[PDB]
Design a binder for this molecule. Structure first.
Ligand SMILES: *[C@@H]1O[C@H](CO)[C@@H](O)[C@H](O)[C@H]1NC(C)=O
Lengths: 40, 29
């Protein structure tokens, strides 16, 4: 991890991924397939 | 980090994985 090797962070943090899965799940529950086609 | 050269000549610099004490200055993760 120090012979010229490095690990870079992801662009979206685990909390930003969890906001996306929450938004997908809350869209699915409250509005059916409609939020994929247009407005929820 | 740059806007286009058709847009500005300002730039910003990221020292990847380096703490700012070791290098306007800001400590990102
Ligand atoms: C950067 O280094 C200083 C001095 O070692 C320390 O106080 C600070 O917490 C460090 N910050 C990060 C993000 O590593």
């Amino acid at each position: 991890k120090f012979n010229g090797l490095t690990v870079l962070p992801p662009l979206l943090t685990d909390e930003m991924i969890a906001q996306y899965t929450s938004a997908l799940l809350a869209g699915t529950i409250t509005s059916g397939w409609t939020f994929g086609a247009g407005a929820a | 980090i740059t806007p286009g050269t058709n847009t500005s000549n300002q730039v910003a610099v990221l020292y990847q994985g380096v703490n700012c004490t070791e290098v306007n200055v800001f400590q990102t993760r």
